[PDB]
Design an enzyme around this catalytic site. Structure first.
Site, PDB file in Angstrom:
ATOM      1  N   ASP A 150      -5.326   5.448  -0.518  1.00  0.00           N
ATOM      2  CA  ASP A 150      -4.715   4.599   0.642  1.00  0.00           C
ATOM      3  C   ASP A 150      -3.499   5.378   1.328  1.00  0.00           C
ATOM      4  O   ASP A 150      -2.490   4.847   1.709  1.00  0.00           O
ATOM      5  CB  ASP A 150      -4.198   3.433   0.014  1.00  0.00           C
ATOM      6  CG  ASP A 150      -5.058   2.131  -0.314  1.00  0.00           C
ATOM      7  OD1 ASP A 150      -5.777   1.924   0.637  1.00  0.00           O
ATOM      8  OD2 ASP A 150      -4.614   1.471  -1.331  1.00  0.00           O
TER       9      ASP A 150
ATOM     10  N   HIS B 147       1.217   1.668  -5.849  1.00  0.00           N
ATOM     11  CA  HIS B 147      -0.238   1.233  -5.835  1.00  0.00           C
ATOM     12  C   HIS B 147      -1.135   2.362  -6.204  1.00  0.00           C
ATOM     13  O   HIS B 147      -1.859   2.357  -7.043  1.00  0.00           O
ATOM     14  CB  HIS B 147      -0.388   0.453  -4.593  1.00  0.00           C
ATOM     15  CG  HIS B 147      -1.841   0.254  -4.243  1.00  0.00           C
ATOM     16  ND1 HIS B 147      -2.619  -0.805  -5.242  1.00  0.00           N
ATOM     17  CD2 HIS B 147      -2.811   0.603  -3.504  1.00  0.00           C
ATOM     18  CE1 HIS B 147      -3.768  -0.806  -4.695  1.00  0.00           C
ATOM     19  NE2 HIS B 147      -4.075  -0.018  -3.575  1.00  0.00           N
TER      20      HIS B 147
ATOM     21  N   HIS C  16       0.830  -1.325  -0.003  1.00  0.00           N
ATOM     22  CA  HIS C  16       0.172  -0.168   0.043  1.00  0.00           C
ATOM     23  C   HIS C  16       0.761   1.236  -0.076  1.00  0.00           C
ATOM     24  O   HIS C  16       0.792   2.094   0.911  1.00  0.00           O
ATOM     25  CB  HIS C  16      -0.873   0.102   1.037  1.00  0.00           C
ATOM     26  CG  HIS C  16      -2.179  -0.989   0.992  1.00  0.00           C
ATOM     27  ND1 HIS C  16      -2.409  -2.090   1.693  1.00  0.00           N
ATOM     28  CD2 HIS C  16      -3.165  -0.944  -0.085  1.00  0.00           C
ATOM     29  CE1 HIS C  16      -3.348  -2.695   1.372  1.00  0.00           C
ATOM     30  NE2 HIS C  16      -3.918  -1.971   0.155  1.00  0.00           N
TER      31      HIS C  16
ATOM     32  N   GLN D  32      -5.651 -17.446  -3.509  1.00  0.00           N
ATOM     33  CA  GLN D  32      -5.951 -16.731  -4.840  1.00  0.00           C
ATOM     34  C   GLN D  32      -6.907 -17.112  -5.262  1.00  0.00           C
ATOM     35  O   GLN D  32      -7.741 -16.173  -5.891  1.00  0.00           O
ATOM     36  CB  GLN D  32      -4.518 -16.768  -5.461  1.00  0.00           C
ATOM     37  CG  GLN D  32      -3.533 -15.909  -5.189  1.00  0.00           C
ATOM     38  CD  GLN D  32      -3.893 -14.443  -4.784  1.00  0.00           C
ATOM     39  OE1 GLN D  32      -4.311 -13.586  -5.844  1.00  0.00           O
ATOM     40  NE2 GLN D  32      -4.134 -13.903  -3.457  1.00  0.00           N
TER      41      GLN D  32
ATOM     42  N   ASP E  25      -8.921  -0.701  -7.808  1.00  0.00           N
ATOM     43  CA  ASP E  25      -8.182  -1.115  -6.513  1.00  0.00           C
ATOM     44  C   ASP E  25      -7.651  -2.603  -6.665  1.00  0.00           C
ATOM     45  O   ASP E  25      -6.438  -2.729  -6.055  1.00  0.00           O
ATOM     46  CB  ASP E  25      -8.939  -1.174  -5.330  1.00  0.00           C
ATOM     47  CG  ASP E  25      -8.282  -0.760  -3.872  1.00  0.00           C
ATOM     48  OD1 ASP E  25      -6.801  -0.337  -4.069  1.00  0.00           O
ATOM     49  OD2 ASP E  25      -8.728  -0.986  -2.489  1.00  0.00           O
TER      50      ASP E  25
HETATM   51  C1  LIG Z   1      -4.786  -8.467  -5.650  1.00  0.00           C
HETATM   52  C2  LIG Z   1      -4.711  -9.629  -5.132  1.00  0.00           C
HETATM   53  C3  LIG Z   1      -5.290 -10.114  -4.054  1.00  0.00           C
HETATM   54  N1  LIG Z   1      -5.269 -11.195  -3.523  1.00  0.00           N
HETATM   55  C4  LIG Z   1      -5.848 -11.379  -2.540  1.00  0.00           C
HETATM   56  C5  LIG Z   1      -6.357 -10.534  -1.643  1.00  0.00           C
HETATM   57  C6  LIG Z   1      -6.957 -10.489  -0.297  1.00  0.00           C
HETATM   58  C7  LIG Z   1      -7.535  -9.342   0.114  1.00  0.00           C
HETATM   59  S1  LIG Z   1      -7.233  -8.219  -1.032  1.00  0.00           S
HETATM   60  C8  LIG Z   1      -6.341  -9.240  -1.918  1.00  0.00           C
HETATM   61  C9  LIG Z   1      -5.866  -9.059  -3.429  1.00  0.00           C
HETATM   62  C10 LIG Z   1      -5.960  -7.760  -3.695  1.00  0.00           C
HETATM   63  N2  LIG Z   1      -5.422  -7.401  -4.908  1.00  0.00           N
HETATM   64 MG   LIG Z   2      -7.384   0.803   0.783  1.00  0.00          MG
HETATM   65 ZN   LIG Z   3      -6.018   0.558  -2.569  1.00  0.00          ZN
END
Ligand SMILES: c1cc2ncc3ccsc3c2cn1
Ligand SMILES: [Mg+2]
Ligand SMILES: [Zn+2]
Length: 321
Positions: A117, A82, A78, A279, A227
């Site tokens: 963020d 990002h 973050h 994932q 996001d």
């Molecule tokens: C990309 C991949 C991701 N893989 C797992 C998780 C789990 C919470 S956000 C998130 C995530 C957010 N952006």
């Molecule tokens: Mg956030």
């Molecule tokens: Zn974000």
């Protein structure tokens, strides 16, 4: 809030973006990763392309950006990188759907994506609430997301930063409400409700972009799509961002372990083998539905849904050794 030194903001005004990149930036799969020194400038370019070369005072826009960059921390995910990835995926969405949105929305969203963020400490909402952190005190729900909008306003309000000051008063309030709402919608917790409502509206054929509340939901989903756009990149970019995401998860886990609390397997570095299934659950339960809903609603966004489907098919190939 920290202010950017005079040396920083001037370098940006001079910045000229390689003409060979102008072609790539227009694509959804575009990755900004390899271009660190050019992020501040690529964002300016994006602003101008989307809302005009006379959207803001360039002197103010440059001040703002460099100070935003300055109030993002060096945590593993973050971070400044990002913020800019999210802004780019939004530009790509705005560009492909330009008129469906007003000019005050485009500039609203681009900035909220950059700002979303701000001052992230690398810890989840849960954590802060669980261990009663001051921020959980200050903000009951959507903790971090409220703080981010706090920061967004607290930068806009620094000597010579207010890129919106030349708006009328009814337009200024108007724009800061896009910002507030967009940011708040990046609280993944609110996304599942939002998504679900919108799906119905579509299926029924009763979705109506004139109707403000509907628009506010569509913007909500756009913010989530943005996001999460790691998952719409080319496989090796996706694999690499996932590394940085978990680096942050694990480092949150590490403090809970430290605190005699067992972390969820997602935030527990000693459970790496579960990541491919982790994932595959996130993609099935979150991303696919997201980009699937976004493409029904705004059809140019297809290749986002397409790319996510591609990377899902890839985590599968890692589940099979
Ligand atoms: C990309 C991949 C991701 N893989 C797992 C998780 C789990 C919470 S956000 C998130 C995530 C957010 N952006
Ligand atoms: Mg956030
Ligand atoms: Zn974000």
């Amino acid at each position: 809030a920290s202010i950017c030194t005079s040396e920083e903001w001037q370098g940006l005004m001079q910045f000229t973006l390689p003409v060979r990149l102008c072609k790539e930036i227009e694509l959804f799969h575009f990755d900004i990763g390899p271009f660190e020194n050019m992020w501040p400038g690529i964002f300016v370019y994006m602003v101008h392309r989307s809302c005009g070369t006379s959207c803001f005072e360039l002197e103010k826009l440059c001040r703002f950006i460099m100070s935003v960059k300055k109030n993002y921390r060096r945590v593993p995910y973050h971070n400044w990188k990002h913020a800019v990835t999210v802004a780019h995926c939004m530009y790509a969405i705005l560009q492909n759907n330009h008129t469906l949105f007003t000019d005050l929305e485009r500039k609203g969203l681009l900035i909220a994506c950059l700002c979303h963020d701000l001052d992230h400490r690398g810890f989840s909402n849960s954590y802060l609430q669980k261990f009663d952190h001051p921020l959980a005190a200050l903000y009951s729900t959507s903790t971090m997301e409220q703080h981010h909008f706090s920061q967004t306003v607290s930068i806009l309000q620094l000597e010579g930063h207010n890129i919106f000051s030349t708006l009328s008063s009814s337009e200024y309030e108007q724009v800061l409400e896009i910002i507030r709402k967009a940011i708040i919608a990046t609280d993944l917790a609110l996304y599942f409700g939002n998504r679900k409502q919108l799906e119905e509206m579509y299926q029924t054929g009763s979705l109506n972009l004139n109707n403000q509340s509907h628009r506010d939901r569509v913007i909500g989903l756009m913010m989530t799509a943005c996001d999460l756009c790691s998952v719409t990149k080319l496989w090796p970019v996706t694999k690499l961002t996932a590394n940085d995401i978990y680096a942050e998860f694990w480092a949150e886990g590490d403090e809970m372990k430290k605190l005699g609390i067992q972390p969820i397997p997602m935030m527990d570095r000693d459970k790496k083998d579960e990541v491919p299934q982790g994932q595959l659950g996130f993609y099935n339960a979150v991303a696919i539905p997201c980009y699937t809903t976004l493409t029904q609603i705004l059809p140019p966004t297809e290749p986002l849904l397409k790319a996510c489907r591609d990377n899902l098919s890839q985590w599968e190939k890692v589940i099979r050794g």
